């Protein structure tokens, strides 16, 4: 579903973040804004 696929990628995607906090807020909110805008 698009929510796995964007969920996925996203979170792959911000695991670049070296910050644990900015990390765990960017793909903890990530999904939420993925989920409401698409």
């Known amino acids: 579903d698009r929510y796995q696929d964007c969920l996925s ?3 792959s995607r911000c695991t670049y973040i ?4 900015g990390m765990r807020a960017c793909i903890g909110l990530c999904a939420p804004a993925c989920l409401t805008s698409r």
């Open 9 to 11: 990628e996203c979170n």
């Open 18 to 21: 070296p910050d644990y906090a």
